[model samples]
Target: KETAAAKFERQHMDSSTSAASSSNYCNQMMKSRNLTKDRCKPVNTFVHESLADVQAVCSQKNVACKNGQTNCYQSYSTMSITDCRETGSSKYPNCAYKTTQANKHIIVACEGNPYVPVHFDASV
Candidate 1:
């Protein structure tokens, strides 16, 4: 089974892409990262920072989750990130995407016994 930590890296970690171009980063990455499953992931984010730094977000200030969960935390500094939003192709198995990179404070939801960060809920 893929652990939460492993999944986080697969979905969000991208330390090398510190500088992103208008290079349709999503269309390819959303698939390459295996986020194109039973249905397309409407929106997702890739953090362009070290795994350690991303993990440290678990210790950041607390925040309210969109659904009112207490598991959210906000990063103090604006970090590099890429937002991947699937294009308006509701068709299955042929999903496409639009990529845009930006710098923003990220908010994540942490969980489980080790208390590691799981989802990239939003960017501030």
Candidate 2:
């Protein structure tokens, strides 16, 4: 079974690349990463930092999630990221997205004994 940590990595991690260079970045990434397999993800963010750095956020300052969850933590340092947003004309199985990059301190919900991020809550 795919664990939550694995799922989170699949959905949000993109440390392999430095920054998005093309308008098609999200279109290709969203598909290559399988985020557009079943349906188009309306919006998603890909962190350009190492997995270890993101996992470290699990131990950073505590913060409330959008749902008021207490397990969320905010990153102490800003990190590079690319946000993929589905286009107005996007359709399932033929997902199209627009890429926007920025540096932000992110928020994520962590769980388990290892205390790794299980959810990408938001960015600050």
Candidate 3:
């Protein structure tokens, strides 16, 4: 069975390379990461750091999540990230996205015995 930790990776992680500057980054990644299957994921973010760095955020300072959960933590280091937003003209099965890149402290919700990010709440 797939744990929520695994699901988080599939939906968010993108550490193999830092090609977020490409205009096509989100369009390709949102699909390659399988976020645009039956319907488009309205918004998403891809962290450019390794999984370990992100996992370490679970041990960083606690913060309030966007959903009002206290399980969130903010990364000690600002990291490169790419945001994916569905284009206004995007349609199902042919989902399109716009990419925006930034360097920011990631805020994520963590859980489990070996705490790890379960949801990416925001970046600041």
Model 1 root-mean-square deviation? 1.8
Better of 1 and 2 by TM-score: 2
* Model 1 lDDT tens row, 69-108: 9889999998999888877755658878888878999999
lDDT at 5, model 1: 73
Instruction: State the lDDT of candidate 2 residue by residue for 8-115, as single tens digits.
Output: 999999999888878999999899888887889899999999999999999899998999879999999999999999999998888989999999999999999798
Q: Model 2 clash pairs?
A: none
Clashes of each: 0, 0, 0
Arrange candidates by lDDT, highest first: which order?
Answer: 2, 3, 1
Q: Against the true structure, candidate 2 has what lDDT?
A: 0.93
Error of 1 at 73 (Å): 0.7
The segments of candidate 3 whose C-alpha lies over 4 angstroms from its true place after superposition are none
Query: Which consecutive 10 residues in model 3 have the weakest lDDT in total?
Result: 16-25
Instruction: Quote each prediction's TM-score.
Output: 0.88, 0.96, 0.94
Query: Model 1 Cα displacement at 117 (Å)?
Result: 0.9
TM-score of 3: 0.94
Candidate 2: C-alpha RMSD after superposition: 0.9
Error of 2 at 58 (Å): 1.0
Residue 8: error of model 1 in Å? Answer: 1.7
